Amino acid sequence: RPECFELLRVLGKGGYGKVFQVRKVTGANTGKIFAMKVLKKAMIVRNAKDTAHTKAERNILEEVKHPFIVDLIYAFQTGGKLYLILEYLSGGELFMQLEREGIFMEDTACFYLAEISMALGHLHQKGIIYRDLKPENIMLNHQGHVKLTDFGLCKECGTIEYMAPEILMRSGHNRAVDWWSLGALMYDMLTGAPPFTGENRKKTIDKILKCKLNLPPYLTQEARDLLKKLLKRNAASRLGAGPGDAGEVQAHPFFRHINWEELLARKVEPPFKPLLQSEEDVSQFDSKFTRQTPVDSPNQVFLGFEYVAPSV
Numbered sequence: 001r002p003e004c005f006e007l008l009r010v011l012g013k014g015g016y017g018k019v020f021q022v023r024k025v026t027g028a029n030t031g032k033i034f035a036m037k038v039l040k041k042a043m044i045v046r047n048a049k050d051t052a053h054t055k056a057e058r059n060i061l062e063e064v065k066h067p068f069i070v071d072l073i074y075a076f077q078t079g080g081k082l083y084l085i086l087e088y089l090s091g092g093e094l095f096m097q098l099e100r101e102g103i104f105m106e107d108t109a110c111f112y113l114a115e116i117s118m119a120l121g122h123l124h125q126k127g128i129i130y131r132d133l134k135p136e137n138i139m140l141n142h143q144g145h146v147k148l149t150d151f152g153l154c155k156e157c158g159t160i161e162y163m164a165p166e167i168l169m170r171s172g173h174n175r176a177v178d179w180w181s182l183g184a185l186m187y188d189m190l191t192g193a194p195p196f197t198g199e200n201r202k203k204t205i206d207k208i209l210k211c212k213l214n215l216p217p218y219l220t221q222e223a224r225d226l227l228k229k230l231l232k233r234n235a236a237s238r239l240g241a242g243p244g245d246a247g248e249v250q251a252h253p254f255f256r257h258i259n260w261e262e263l264l265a266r267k268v269e270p271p272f273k274p275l276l277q278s279e280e281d282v283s284q285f286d287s288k289f290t291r292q293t294p295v296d297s298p299n300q301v302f303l304g305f306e307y308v309a310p311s312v
């Protein structure tokens with residue numbers, strides 16, 4: 001429980017609680033740094049979908065161990081709070097790397113999109129959907145591989161720039177939305193901007209719903225092609241929208257230089273290497289958050305929420 005963890009830093013904040021950087025104190029894994037995520041039970045239980053959703057996240061981070069998905073090392077509770085201990089992803093938000101770098105070289109984008117396309121594959125086999133591939137929602141670990149992290153209540157629910165039309169029309173949707181999203185993510189990577197904007201939210205949607213795609217000349221034919229098959233407004237036919245799913249996608253010429261087995265084993269050199277002078281090094285995050293002093297102010301429905309990662 002809470003006592004074992006010393007709050008080193010604030011890494012993220014929101015309506016529902018906070019994400020803390022903390023070093024464990026007692027027992028082995030003593031000294032080891034983690035990320036602590038704390039939700040107020042208060043704000044979750046007064047809504048229906050919120051509670052199920054928090055619980056889904058709880059059960060998904062357990063059912064799903066996979067190279068490219070934030071792990072759960074402990075989970076537990078108290079009075080009015082919810083605690084998850086995740087590995088601490090010092091690589092920060094893909095969002096940040098994209099700002100620091102401004103734009104990505106193709107084979108740079110290719111490496112991230114590849115790794116990501118594998119977590120969707122994995123996720124889709126457990127009949128799980130990720131919905132949102134904004135760079136904000138994607139993190140890097142210490143060695144700089146990708147980590148999908150957001151499976152629960154979101155951090156507020158943010159920009160819509162990376163949402164397929166079927167979600168924005170609420171017409172009903174499936175695992176296909178992810179491939180639309182992946183395309184939008186890709187396009188942004190290669191051009192420095194989401195495929196649709198967007199004086200404002202209202203107009204952005206109109207674009208995402210109505211406008212023709214815009215493929216700059218400096219885009220290689222394969223990339224021009226992926227973007228087009230992935231940003232398909234008709235879902236039935238959006239690449240990846242078939243029984244083969246992730247497979248249909250990974251098998252596009254864009255990904256011809258990818259060794260899926262080495263990639264999965266984290267043996268492909270990440271295009272960028274988090275610069276860490278230490279385990280707790282946070283110079284990859286945003287001193288907007290890291291500056292602040294880390295404080296944890298003090299018939300439930302969250303049964304056997306507690307959790308402990310098997311060996312270790």
Ligand SMILES: NC(=O)c1cccc2c(N[C@H](CN3CCC3)c3ccc(Cl)c(C(F)(F)F)c3)ncnc12
Pocket residue numbers: 011012013014015016017018019034035037038039070086087088089090093136137138139149150153154155
């Ligand atoms: N594991 C880490 O090292 C680590 C380090 C920093 C942030 C996160 C994080 N933050 C997500 C936001 N995701 C990160 C990209 C978009 C998040 C989700 C729900 C909530 Cl309520 C919050 C909170 F408001 F801060 F509590 C944050 N989620 C998971 N691990 C993190």
